[PDB]
């Protein structure tokens, strides 16, 4: 699961 934030 990749980073969904900035």
């Amino acid at each position, epitope marked *: *699961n990749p980073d*969904p934030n*900035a």
Partner: antibody
Amino acid sequence: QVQLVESGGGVVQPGRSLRLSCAASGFTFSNFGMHWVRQTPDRGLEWVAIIWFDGSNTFYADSVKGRFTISRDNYKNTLYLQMNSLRAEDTAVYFCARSFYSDSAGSLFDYWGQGTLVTVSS
Amino acid sequence: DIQMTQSPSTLSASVGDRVTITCRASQSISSWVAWYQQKPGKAPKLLIYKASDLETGVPSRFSGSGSGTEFTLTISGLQPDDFVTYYCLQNMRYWTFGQGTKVEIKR
């Protein structure tokens, strides 16, 4: 402090639609990915959908692909969930959940809303 | 998908006990396991992430271990406020919770 407030729950006739909202405050809403997670009395915690901070990417659980749609308003700071073709399996409490990511932890949940009940009945 | 199963479904102990909840995965997920605690009527709360990393502010009696397929949550010295429900979560491919474990007061 962080505050997530769900609204829009209620009774839906099978096959009809419904939209849920989640008012975020106390942080920069535009920088965090957001989740929807639901809970059934006898099925447990079931992840529904995730949307990116900028809304670029979006993924759904298989049980809702084609029926549900997760959107986002980075100005009114509100998360949305459009629910079409509601089944009885969809009856549950729907939680708003902010995404937490770190290099060691990965994508997770940290701040949740109070939940809102959706009852698919006739 | 990846399935998550916790054992046992219901735990019976007294205040001060040391109890362990075990979470098994349907396929190897390395150390991508978190542990959440849900109190009645309230939302889940993060306690452990990455199998064994304690979340900030969580008391030290909570503890987690495991790698691959089997994972354990341990509470050394149960407190009165701990007799609730505990879920394990995988965060390798998407997210899957266990069924939950109610910790019950033995009488």
